[PDB]
A paper describes a structure:
XepA crystallized from several conditions in multiple crystal forms. The crystal structures of the two highest diffracting crystal forms are reported here. XepA forms a remarkable pentameric structure in which two disc-shaped domains are connected by a linker region. Comparing the XepA structures in different crystal forms, only minor differences in the overall fold can be observed. A superposition of the whole pentamer of XepA crystal forms I and II resulted in an r.m.s.d. of 0.9 Å. However, using only the C-terminal pentamer disc of the different crystal forms to calculate the superposition matrix (r.m.s.d. of 0.3 Å), the molecule shows a domain motion in the tunnel and N-terminal disc corresponding to a rotation of 2.1°. Although it may be conceivable that high flexibility in the XepA linker region may permit a conformational change, for example a rotational movement of the C-terminal and N-terminal discs to open the pore area, this would require a major structural realignment. Comparisons with viral portal proteins show that the XepA tunnel has a relatively small diameter of approximately 10 Å, which suggests that it is too small to allow the entry of any DNA molecule (dsDNA, 20 Å; ssDNA, 15 Å).
Residue numbers in the entry:
A (entry chain E), D (entry chain B): 3 to 279
B (entry chain C): 2 to 279
C (entry chain A): 1 to 279
E (entry chain D): 4 to 279
Amino acid sequence: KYQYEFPLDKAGKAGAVKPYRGGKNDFVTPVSNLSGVAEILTNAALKATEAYSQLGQDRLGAVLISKVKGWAYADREGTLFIEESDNNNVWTTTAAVNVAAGVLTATDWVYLSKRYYRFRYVNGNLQQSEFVLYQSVGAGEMDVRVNEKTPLQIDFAENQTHDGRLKVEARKTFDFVFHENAESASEGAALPVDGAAHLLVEVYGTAEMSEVKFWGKSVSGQKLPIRGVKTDDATTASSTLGKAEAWAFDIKGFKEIIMEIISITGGTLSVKGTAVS
Amino acid sequence: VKYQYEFPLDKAGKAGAVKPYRGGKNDFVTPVSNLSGVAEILTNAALKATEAYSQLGQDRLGAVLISKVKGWAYADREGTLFIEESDNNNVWTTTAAVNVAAGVLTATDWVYLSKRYYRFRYVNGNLQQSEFVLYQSVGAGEMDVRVNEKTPLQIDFAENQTHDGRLKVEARKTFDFVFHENAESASEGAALPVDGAAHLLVEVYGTAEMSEVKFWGKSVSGQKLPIRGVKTDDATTASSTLGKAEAWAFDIKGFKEIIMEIISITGGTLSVKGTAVS
Amino acid sequence: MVKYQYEFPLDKAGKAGAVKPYRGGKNDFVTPVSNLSGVAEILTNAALKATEAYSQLGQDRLGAVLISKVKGWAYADREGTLFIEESDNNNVWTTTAAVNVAAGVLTATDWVYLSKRYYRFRYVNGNLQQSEFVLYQSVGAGEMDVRVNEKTPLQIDFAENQTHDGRLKVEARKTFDFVFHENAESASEGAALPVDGAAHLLVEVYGTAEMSEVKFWGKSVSGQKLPIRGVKTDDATTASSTLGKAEAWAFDIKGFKEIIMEIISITGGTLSVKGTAVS
Amino acid sequence: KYQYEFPLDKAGKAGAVKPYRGGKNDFVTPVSNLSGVAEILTNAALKATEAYSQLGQDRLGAVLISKVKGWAYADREGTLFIEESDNNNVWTTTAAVNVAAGVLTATDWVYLSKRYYRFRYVNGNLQQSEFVLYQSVGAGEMDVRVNEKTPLQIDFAENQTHDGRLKVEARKTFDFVFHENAESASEGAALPVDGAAHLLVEVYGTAEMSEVKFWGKSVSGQKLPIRGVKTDDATTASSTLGKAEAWAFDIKGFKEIIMEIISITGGTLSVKGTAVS
Amino acid sequence: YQYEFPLDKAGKAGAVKPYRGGKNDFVTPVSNLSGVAEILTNAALKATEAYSQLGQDRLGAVLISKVKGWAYADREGTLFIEESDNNNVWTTTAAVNVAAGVLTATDWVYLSKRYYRFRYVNGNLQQSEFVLYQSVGAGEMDVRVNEKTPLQIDFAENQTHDGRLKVEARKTFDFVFHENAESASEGAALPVDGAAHLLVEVYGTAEMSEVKFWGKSVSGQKLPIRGVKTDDATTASSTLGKAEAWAFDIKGFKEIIMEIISITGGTLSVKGTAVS
């Protein structure tokens, strides 16, 4: 017999309900998810350095336990361990929380992975005169629909922002091979520009003599001479007879870039670059 | 079979599946769980080496409309748990597959079902089990919810969508535009809508023996204003050209429209096409 | 009238309840529940002739349970079409959703959020007689307030249409037009462009005025006017003012608070000064 | 007494449950939050311009009412008012919704603040022959944890985007005081660059003579001369003897910028700027 | 009470409502306990008089996580939500002014200590009407949001500017090529990693020194690069000087090297900032 009393309906029928609406002419069953219920594991005061160990709790049964939370109160300091075991014999510690003297201490919800869970409480160097340890468990996952015309109010971790701004990377890089160890004249491979703005082209190899002609393609598909800027001396040219050098191009608006070996003698030539946004 | 739980009695001696609460334990509440938290044990029969357990097909269609299924397996030896679906309860397709290591509780994800029938199928590995249990949970339905907006929820981007803690973004857009296609007479041709583009590359090409293209933008008044372009081959700056088989780069920031007008043309055709970039 | 194979467990005193035991000792109880959205009614399992229709009687949403939404499942050995329909008068129907039901394939509708008073399912069989057919209907109601408690940030995912090569598509550029002067017929500073993070400005000067002088100004922190230089589009002239018209001037305005195009003098008609600022 | 029938378990016991699983060997209680339940307030047809007024409903009781929603159906047009009162005597309208002839009309959920709520319905200029008015109420707030390992797929409002692209602002602006009404030589305050790329500096005041020297600091902390471009004539210099003028600086890669007054006579000088990203 | 449980077809009472067109299905209306309230008091207080609820232990079969209050009075007062670990010494968690004749609600207060209570202090006028209600909650349901269905987000006001998301696209890092070098070496190679601009400072006691400016692209061979000196806009691929800074366009490079070719009569440092 408890202190609560179930109310009666108009015909004298008891129910675990509350009345509502202005005339108290409707009924509703008050409920709590099982995550809101708690079991008291122990209130036995521990000696200095003495431990309480809950018997292994099997998660597997009619209710499939997914998670566990603890509350500890003691008049002296100790440590609450949440532990897990796949064999109910060898235990690993999933969480450990300091329980200060005279301070209600709560764990987080711990999402379980192994088959068995337990609480283990180790008292500190002073004898408790007062101790309670409570355990809650939960289960399952309900589908929910957020109102389509009520946006979720979001913001970003302070680590993902600077001065209230989201940190973004707008620049992308990719390398491209026009020619690798070419030993004769050819256009080689055409770089697809794909929104890139800037291109750095390296010309290098054993070739005693070589000529590289700088080309872009726009809408017609015909090759158009483009000018590059040589890194060492700022020479601007639409071709080179040289090597062990690099050329910078503004390629905004082009569809393709071609570095054509027009002629080559007495060795090989590689033509490779990096395109940037 | 009586369990160790006992329903409490109210003040009038009435049993209920309730717990007391408030300081004086003078109120009651029914503990509940959505059915997604309930599980059925499918089998605990130990399998021989390579032997399979197959659940009979479960019809999703019923008084309770099953939307999703989740499994747990524990075995002292290794095996594989398959979640399968069938529209005819005869031919099975595998929706999910999980390796179950020896002595390790293994869980599937929630699998959202599409076909009419679902089942678990467990294939034991090369060693006979001495201990095996397989649990199945199902869910149904969808609760409409209004999220209390007192504090925003913190969101994050996939590690695949970030680089050095930065969100990867593409700010640049590209579009091609035809000013003139095989024009055989003088006209302004089509006006490019700038729409926040910053840079334009214009190619002039065709059979025309002679042609003049004049470079224009429009700002707020709608009157044509001469603009200057830079020719790709020699870095010539000009507001028009008598040439072809050439391309001209323009800064178009702030313009509403760009026009490449053929002023004159003889002895063939001329195309004028470009690519605008932001 | 109706006895199933489920069995209610007993408490320590032998009392049945619609509960499951839990905790290691099975010394606690919990009532398994499902929101009504998870429950279904079978509307029909009567096999239809070729082209024959099933029409559910209009369902009134208004009642002790206020129906907000409806979802359907259909299975048939032959192809057909499932319609979710609505009516304010239970007589004239509009189709809210229609789904093709392939032969031998469980077909689900979306949840349909209802607006009219009455809802129904209508199923029209295709050109082959069914030998097997079931049609299920689920309904829901209400809206629960919730508080979302997260221990980690929520991970977000973008539509494939919102991304390109694993990058979020963004527009960083904004454009706005501004009127400094419209058909001015006398000298004045006119209106001050608020720069507000814009970087580039194009200014057009046009009108009937026979003579005019426009002076180019920016304001920084003090609010004192500072002469600024523009580049004329037609010939790349750089200047801090103009006596001309039917011309446009490009300005780098990074760091300025305001831009002013002052008509210093004007005779023999009117003058407009208008521009576009770009970020 | 209704057409539904409670099923029986294997031992013949009735329950407000449904069977589930393949063998129908498990049970579940179908539930609805009370927000899904409705009361019919009235079906009494109104004269032209006649009102229905619900008696004030007290939110305070065993169920604490948080919110209210209405549905109205009538063969003629009218207006549904949701009203609140702190004294159950003076009524303020929180929401008013037009109810068209022959069209089910729903309000939004209205979150209540005063002690009492009611519906008031005012019929239009034509006598009703058919009218029903339904009220739903809610209460409370459930704590929930959203699945931490599953991405939410989100979609941007058309107002958040342009041509399918998310609208972003990459540029930031901040004002900085190097000197305010200085009347003597000093370095003044050092601008922290913090990723800014461009600086506009204004020099102004009564000083008869002044020299301002333009400095940046890199990693060592030593001052390095920098060059600015004067806005009116494009003069490039690392210092100025002038005032009522402004200087533009490229500050990319600098840690700090200093506008040093080297000398000043016969009045005061202010040096202020705007840094941009 | 005025409510009546309906009967099923066999005459069985239940806390249910009928539904579907034929009223041939049943459902149990429920409310989470957070929707339920207890009336603590309706005893009218004298001027300045206080009501104090006895300490409520959160620890029990139902583990109380949170509490919310409503107060109504015909005269003004103050509602305090308080917490205690010992049910003796109280700290105030929340305080809400209650205006005359105005229903006043607290927020949900998420409890930390073992015991909670409401304390109400009446103002300077005797109440003739007063009620005080208390709701509690417990637990936390795991949920899957909008599994098949796209949802909209809205950005924090702090992250937005004229309807645009504020982003920082520019990143900065400092790099040491050389610190107090006393002999010739390449020093450390800056990884460019998408940086576009580099500022390099050269400083120290060295009487004489040469720094050569290098980039590496795809081949891995050093390529001469040109810098612009901050003081006079000199362009060069090397310097014999110090107490100077050089700006480089490094777009497209993989690495940057500031090589000390020679050094006499002291030390030299070479340090920079790379930006995107």
